[PDB]
């Protein structure tokens, strides 16, 4: 249960705006454990797979183009209720409606330039992690601060 | 649309408590662009005009007295949905009910000493900006970070 | 009214995670005044009294054991609406459901390791303060920033 | 003596990089009092006057061009030893040689894009303030935190 | 050796300026362990004893008066080289000459209102701790983060 | 010249203490560009190669053991004078002697647990980058903020 994992990606706008360290620090302070981490420029295929769920929609081409427009920092965090907790820390789709204190609430203004991606569910988290990372790239032995869990 | 503007004023208590830089930084981090900025001690007339909407109420005299009691930092910010977004960043009238993460939620305790003023609408924003600033004092050419807007 | 007081305790996990200064700073920035402060390792009796309200429940033994497992930083803050305001700053019982910007929302993950204690009411605040502090240990003459209250 | 004043200007690169609030906060935290403040796009004449001391040098044309390339946030701070203290807070001409903790040490990399200007002496501070601000724009009645001066 | 201790006191100006949490956080982040902590209003006798080394000097009366003018937060920190390390974190006697990054460099302007006290040596640290704290008030069992010491 | 690169590694203690995001943010704020990034648990061979320069010394076995004791966040930053600048931001070998404002000055206490590694020269930076990263893992097209370089 405390072994739950989520996939987060600091999108090109977030990387370009120098928000990588600020975003990672928020998750480390919360107590989640960094299990995978690497910077990369996504290829079209990985992009199309990541957004496959929208492949029938019109905006799908825009999503693929943007995520491949520059480097992305992909990461996997582990902890209890991480998937839902990470979404709460990010905010809502529209940054302008995101509450102050959340990532998008503090730094974003446009839905199209919303800084970060967080899996919306455990199953999507599982698919995305396996999509973005090779098993060799993920920590197998995870140990959080002992003052974090009862 | 991304040319929307709002008027913000760091009231005398906020200036006296050394919260000017902290408040400006929150808006700059969000991505809004500083279009006008100056410190001044409001005269009675500008004050009465700013709060004209309350001129029939009893507390109106108290509002005018306080805002003229010391320096005020007036500023104009530009961005998409800035008017509503800036209000969300400020919090609610009563600082004690404002959520942690918002300006009044983080620093205020009294309705009467609530640190900052934000226009409540585009039309009030337009009236206030034209009230507090001469056109010469506002940037005509505004350019935000290109990683902010799609 | 502006003489209202609340009891806060940074529990063993919070002390062990180096969150004492971060927690105090949040309350000082808000404008509340530190009226009592000391680090101690609670004895079983003080613990049982603090959680007396749960003495009939099963988890009561767990509460007493944990709070006595290490040092605790007890403090008393004074200000208008401090009791409710301090609870809002802390968040909800479950850290995972606490909103970003609140103490538990920013730093906690487990109900059992939720970092801090805040009185839930004026009467409980009164009982706890008198329980944890000798009158000699509390400031009698309190003076907040004059820019805080109208 | 505690009435000493200095002129600071957040140059175009600093304004464009969203460092205005961060810079003001550093001076407010230190205890200096904001006496003048306004955003403006310097004209060529004000620029040439500001850098008149270099009018015989080759790089002088570059200085004038850059400072007039965009908005600048000009400010005047008051306090004991403000002139030398503000320079120490800024760092050295070359940002790369500026120590971590100073403005240029924390945020700059190029001598040509060094973020901020601080008067190098009382006499230059006097000339610059009178150059950049009309007397009407400066606070006459200055009152710092009483816990700042003995 | 890693059991070395120092005495720190947040003086009345520091407490009044809301700098208590900020100061404690700096020491916790560094890795030092809080061993004693309490707020108090020093009596004349404790004051005269604390500054006994200056009892023959003229300014001695001023030191005693100020430290007894309001609450003080006394604390004892433990760690390797804590005594010298804590002084380096504080800065020099004159806040204006203290480097940015240090406590006095970041927040002070006057020698007379220099925010904090740090023992200048192990022997003075020993005398001050035994002067300000009863043994019952100090942690006997100290355990720092295991990732701090080799 | 503005294409200079350095290799930084957040060692196991730094990763375990949740300092990864804090360290990256310091470099991003400075203006350096993240060119490579990944978390890994170094193997003995990579370790021995990284510290090959000390292979004749006694402490060499201790260095290899520690760096392989847990995950490490390796990164490559690009910018003008990055190699020397990054060392200045880190501090000196002994954290206790590192000045407040630097990474080791703010967070470390023991030479053996000094949080981070920074190449000491361009040639060592070149050897380390080629040692720790495959060319495919480094950005070829680097573009910093245009407000950073003249």
Swiss-Prot record, chains A, B, C, D, E, F:
Localization of this protein: Cytoplasm
Active site residues per record: 117
One GO cellular component, as annotated: plasma membrane
Record flagged with keyword Zinc: no
Main location: cytoplasm
Catalytic reaction list: a 2'-deoxyribonucleoside 5'-diphosphate + ATP = a 2'-deoxyribonucleoside 5'-triphosphate + ADP; a ribonucleoside 5'-diphosphate + ATP = a ribonucleoside 5'-triphosphate + ADP
Highest taxon in the source lineage: Eukaryota
The keyword tRNA-binding is assigned to this record: no
GO molecular function terms noted in the UniProt entry: ATP binding; metal ion binding; nucleoside diphosphate kinase activity
SUPFAM superfamilies per record: Nucleoside diphosphate kinase, NDK
EC class name: transferase
GO biological process terms, semicolon-separated: actin cytoskeleton organization; asexual reproduction; CTP biosynthetic process; dGTP biosynthetic process from dGDP; G protein-coupled receptor signaling pathway; GTP biosynthetic process; negative regulation of exocytosis; negative regulation of phagocytosis
Family note: Belongs to the NDK family.
Its job: Major role in the synthesis of nucleoside triphosphates other than ATP.
Assembly description: Homohexamer.
Protein name: Nucleoside diphosphate kinase, cytosolic
